[PDB]
Symmetry: D2
Subunit: 498 residues, 4 copies
């Protein structure tokens, strides 16, 4: 019997765990400490959540270590670990309306989007990785033979062991699922730290691990602060790998802590300032649709959002006019209402950052075409924003907004290399995109863009089977695809002589 | 015209460059600073070598950046890059005696061993990776289709860009080759820092890159200190990846420096304390031969050296008697003489460390069965040493010697799990081995050993196709094999909608 | 509604379809022609089954073609084809008792075995292959560039189109499942011809595909003769691939027919005469247990059955004595009775072959230690048989029995090559095995055995992730594992210049 | 010494072996039978060549079988097999002018083209496959464990054994190289039958294998007839695999022969009627350059030649005018003149067929815009030909000419699916291309074309790393690329219990 916060909302009765999940049980933090999680649609407290302390991290890690070394998870067939993860995907899908409603409450995700992406992609992620379990394979390798003797050399793919996963607040359940699905399919056990401001879908996900029959200790979830709980995961001597998504600064600090403790493996998905180049020979009405989606999707709280749009000179004014016409049709609203297509920002501090960003944009001289302000209504809503006449030296040409602000620069007709050079002049390299009907330009621009993902005539088209990760200061290592498994496996080489 | 230090020795004329190699030219360091390199066979100065400073590191990085971004290396076909690397392997083979002779003078490597391993394995490495260049392939991925439209997703494998490689002194040419062949096969450019005490085969290799036609800037070599040159390569904003082999403490510091500068990728091959478990049912004579080799190969200055031997109770005394008989047969002496099979230690400070190490083993209670001291002859020779009665809590049971010191413990007849536990009780996890004629026990032990390489009925059997790298605090990432390439490549995902 | 033959048996009410399955529906054959299917436990008629004619085949091929070119199967995402195959496996699981009872009636499979293998391995096969759908990937390849232009080259893995699958009677549902799971996972559609004597689980399977939602025409099932229905599948100009398992002679004829019609692709899994070599140093009691299993599993009706046991001279007589003891404990009976462990032979003509085989064995001089005859009871039961003093020139040392007949030769102590030579002196090369505790012997024998599969210290250990197929006259191509997908996919190379 | 036909030509003194090559030696055929090989530039006899008989094929197969089972080729490391194949490529490069001269004389290949393609690509093929030898790798597979025991499953890639290679006359040395490089890289030995009409570069290549140190018997070459030598190779009980390139009818009879002997493996590269679709938004002058090359390259004797061009209605007439302007600039003449761009057809009977083919195209109503006839000059030159007003039911719209005959049809502006239907209405499926600047068309067209290779905005762009092979009646299996290796390897599954 679990304690729940019960809430009747969206024609459902939600049952939300709110405690730490350690060793297959929900338990209070040390000294029963708690904190409040806030609903961004009206500013209210949703409920109190356990606030993990250092001694709770140590309990979670111990539980994970025990589950890995002596529990069932380390003894079952790869195929049977697969069945458990498939079953976990079924359980999530049976609770999909509920998880999507929690995410609407906790994170501001518009409900219909949350059902299809926040939740629907997490379910795809578990199913996808469940199918890898018994298809992760090593090699047999034709090495030189120590004649007159013989040699056989093979590699075995083994789990790393206990991992810690630290994730951000923009897609709480989906980021959790990206990393956890690959981590568990590889045979590891895990301690997860959701972002403090968005713990609830993680804790409900935890309960679902019980329903799916995941052995106790395999998954542990610790709502709590980065500087305390995240830091202790990075320093812990029994943790063998950290997977991190979040900002560049915090990723530097996590990589440093992995170094100074036990050289634990790390992967990092860090910030972006992703460019989208739109040529005059593109399909203009699709460029406007996909151009808006690259900025406004998920209220701009999107790791791969296009952070600059470069638009060729001859279509630039017509492009801005069409975007303004579509912007005006967007419906801002409570994320639980069916007609809503733009929900609130995730939390108050982030809303404050966005207001300040756009003041700085106006102050340094860009043209504010629309938006820029907090919407007058309760909660933390931000008006979709369009800036034009952005120049390369401006702050908003360099800094990632993580909000629904479209930042447009022009480039001269016929220029390809000059616009590439401005798109690549950033220390980030997470994503990028190009719109053009011309196959030669599309192939040449996708070769020259210095980013982990290049979208061509589309944007935001991620897929559980297509690896996602950045270059340069956006980090290294992939989530999704077969590539994500290599972060959670190690290779043992075995060489016989006979 | 290159300046050389010329020397008649070993039936050849050595022509040794002694300057920095930057942008395809040998140059003095800033201020013409220099340092001496010392011949371990007699303590004498071989010659003066330029001493790279921070502004030389900057010069080497800029030439590597320019060779990558604009020079011919970044434009030729992958297949033509492979031709240039095969040609470099051919030029190395044409100079094989001269390379091996330099290695005997600079590092103390016995000549006949340097010919077959230091040099011979380097040549194999470049020919192996040269064959990879036009076989490195990305993927096409069956993603979900945004109906009524279609999607095509592919991955491209691309070079990471400028790399820094920092290597230890135990196999100067071979460690450089392992990392540099995989780095260059992937299409990168590189700045290499050899261990300060062993620069000379690296600078001769630099000269061979000119004879092979490798474009200027692709390879840059900076003899100099880790605390100055290595440090600046780890800090540099234009270096994108660091490959490192060396001690655990230095690899922690490098990883930390990668994090605090620009999140550069990093691979680490670090210390080891590798266990070799010898069961009573092995072929005993062969266990002696291979057990000696696991300790004494290359005067024990060998990353995968067995740091402990566990010998089953009922064969322990007979194994120790036969080892002592074979150690009496070893011929210690000048590495250029054909009968030598035990050359000097690499440099004086390391000889001192081994003298102290064996003092500590004696002090804490282990039985010194032979050796323990400097050999009374010029240069830095150390006696092949055997300790018995070693107990798990002893410093010599935990610390890596990196010298020709065989460290023997017993284990009870029919124990398997108990000896495994003792073999695994270390934060290292680089290599390991088991001798047994019993198939079940061999397979089971290899599963249970927590190390990146497990040898079965052999030892030291590395191969350019077989990935090599450690677990836990021995680091991460592979050298050799196809797996090595992944440290030097990045993956770009490209998604079209049409 | 579907017509069923209803049968109360094994505490279930079986509902068995008995018509052709074409285009999503059960229909009579042309002219309403039918034939009887025979219960091997008593010789009685289970029921009448539609007897496909040429016009039926053409219809089935037409429906498969339309389903591939225009139907839903050809349009859905690979991921959603995978979900359908996993739902199919779930539905087979919900009917596992029923399927295993049908297979007990139709093929004489002992019910407890059929539940674990015939049916339980079928379910594993569909789940394994379902996971492959969205993980089948092509390549991007670094070809030479047509400077000053660029080139991109990729490969796409596509379905081959309409396939025909012709299977034997020994594991009717499991052989169907092996091939169909890989065929459908690769995106193809299929016409399946079960062995005429065992149509019933295939027909039941057909019904299950309707329950699982597989689009109509993707799976079509035609009970009927090889010489008529199988032959027309091999000749048909719209079938693009045949997958075949059965005898070598029919395999040759199907290959020839593929060639003369439209060069359709073909895979073949043909006979075997698989040797098992048992050395004096093996675990003897285990060798008896696994040696018994290698011959008598599934009444000897087992493609991978060891057809010759070679037993080292010093343990031969004691091996034979222990085999006779275990043979005497076998309970021969009705496959529905729980204590049975040896069921009847599949059909009468096969029983006659086995009687003639053992007559020839006795005639040519082998020693008959037990069995050799039809058991005195209704049905087609065959007494488990052991022959010793088998010499390499004897018919029964060359020809595959497919029956519960253990065929034993000696080899001299210490011989390894000489027994390899005898074990390899056959035109077949399907499976093989070796029992020995010696690692060096096991690795060497497994290198020298000329067979698709080598078991070491076990036998009959097939796995749905492990590819299974023959060398020489046992055919080519694999079922099971990633390799099986290659028979059902084609590779298209796309090369752009830009 | 080897007997040569000596000929002073092209500034060289060619030395051409003319005998059978069996077991490392040039020998006369049985009864000293010989036949003439004919220079197509003037109809003269070049020399007499041995004419292999049945007993000569048996000798070559015996020598290939001994070389594989007992000789050095079966025992050396995979890496050292690769060094010998890279040494063979170097010897071919040292003789490249003499090989290209022999191909100009024997096959009519224009010398400058024979240097870069017939010869230059053969050299790239041996270098590329030489790099695969020590990178062919098997797998280790996470099967279910037979608890309380453990299982290890691995696969080994092994050579198939003795192979027969049967090749056509259009690129004598290059088709030999494509199949032989991959066959030998995988470890096999081979008997090669070159086209009877073009034996000479094959025999010169056999002599190069001696200079490269390939062990005697690993390569055997038997000039003579398909129906005698080729037939006996396909029937031979010790040949395990046939690699064939040529016409559909012969490929069907070969596959039937493999089936009726010993189920040997077979790969088949058969005819083509490859379509090239030129849209109105292409780059027109390039389309004309590439369109011309798609047909006329190597005098149309080119397995991937475009056999139909479809040109969108609004550019058709301008396309044809530009074609005729280009064809008028083609210089026809002796293949040694360095301005020749159009050499003679390969032999007399093929020229005759081209004359009949064109008479037939005029007769059925197509418009002859130029050519259609033998050029009046000694030898077998055929005039470059252009047909317009070709309709889908015509013989020349269905049958492959294999000659320099451009076959053009219009298709309607804006149709895409309709021209695709017509491009796909053939039982061939070897190659195809599309010229268009529009990315959406190029991608959609490449997905819908039913051909093993699709070129986009280029043609004839084959590459040793990019697999090449047909669909439908164009056969199956690939040459080139990693995929070619799989035709020449078998997979052994080895499964342990411990
Ligand atoms: N098993 C292994 O794979 C492995 C390999 C090598 C060594 N070891 C262990 O380490 C010991 C060797 O000691 P060591 O002091 O010679 O090795 P080390 O300090 O780890 O040196 C390795 C390389 O790192 C460089 N380096 C030092 N500080 C650096 C910094 N701050 N930034 C960048 N690079 C830096 C060194 O330069 P300098 O030339 O100035 O020192 C040297 O080239 C051995 O006794 C052995 O136990 C283990």
């Amino acid at each position: 019997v679990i304690n729940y916060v019960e809430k009747a909302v969206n024609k459902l009765t939600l049952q939300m765990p709110y405690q730490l999940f350690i060793g297959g049980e929900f338990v209070d933090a040390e000294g029963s400490k708690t904190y409040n999680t806030i609903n961004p649609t009206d500013g209210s407290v949703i409920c109190q959540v356990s606030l993990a302390q250092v001694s709770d991290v140590d309990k979670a890690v111990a539980a994970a270590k025990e589950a890995f070394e002596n529990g069932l998870w380390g003894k079952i067939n790869a195929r049977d670990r697969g069945r458990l993860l498939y079953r976990l995907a079924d359980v999530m899908e049976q609770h999909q309306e509920e998880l999507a409603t929690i995410e609407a409450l906790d994170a501001g995700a518009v409900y219909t989007l949350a059902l299809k992406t926040h939740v629907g992609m997490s379910i795809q992620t578990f199913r996808y990785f469940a199918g890898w379990c018994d298809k992760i394979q090593g090699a047999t390798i034709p090495i030189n033979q120590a004649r007159p003797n013989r040699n056989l050399t093979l590699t075995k793919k083994e789990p790393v062991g206990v991992c810690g996963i630290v994730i951000p607040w923009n897609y709480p359940l989906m980021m959790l699922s990206w990393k956890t699905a690959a981590c568990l399919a590889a045979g590891n056990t895990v301690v997860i730290k959701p972002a403090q401001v968005t713990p609830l879908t993680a804790l409900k996900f935890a309960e679902l691990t019980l329903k799916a029959g995941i052995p106790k200790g395999v998954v542990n979830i610790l709502p709590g602060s980065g500087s305390l709980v995240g830091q202790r995961l990075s320093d812990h001597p029994d943790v063998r790998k950290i997977g991190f998504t979040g900002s560049t600064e915090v990723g530097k600090h996590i990589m440093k802590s992995c170094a100074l403790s036990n050289v634990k493996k790390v992967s990092l998905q860090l910030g972006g300032k992703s460019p989208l180049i739109i040529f005059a020979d593109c399909d203009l009405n699709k460029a406007v649709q996909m151009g808006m989606s690259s900025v406004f999707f998920n209220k701009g709280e999107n790791c791969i959002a296009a952070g600059r749009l470069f638009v060729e000179e001859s279509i630039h004014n017509q492009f801005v006019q069409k975007v303004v016409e579509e912007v005006e049709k967007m419906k801002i609203g409570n994320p639980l209402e069916r007609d809503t297509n733009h929900g609130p920002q995730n939390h108050e501090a982030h809303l404050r950052k966005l207001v300040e960003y756009c003041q700085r944009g106006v102050k340094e001289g860009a043209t504010l075409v629309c938006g820029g302000n907090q919407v007058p209504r309760p909660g933390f809503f931000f008006q979709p924003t369009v800036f034009t006449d952005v120049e390369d030296h401006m702050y908003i040409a360099k800094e990632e907004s993580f909000g629904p602000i479209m930042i447009i620069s022009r480039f001269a007709d016929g220029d390809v290399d000059a616009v590439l050079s401005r798109a690549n002049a950033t220390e980030f390299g997470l994503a990028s995109g190009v719109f053009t009907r011309d196959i030669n330009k599309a192939l040449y621009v996708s070769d020259k863009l210095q980013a982990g993902t290049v979208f061509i005539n589309t944007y935001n088209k991620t897929d559980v089977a297509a690896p996602f990760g950045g270059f340069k200061q956006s980090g290294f290592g992939k989530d999704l695809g077969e590539a994500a498994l290599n972060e959670y496996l190690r290779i043992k080489t075995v060489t016989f002589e006979y």
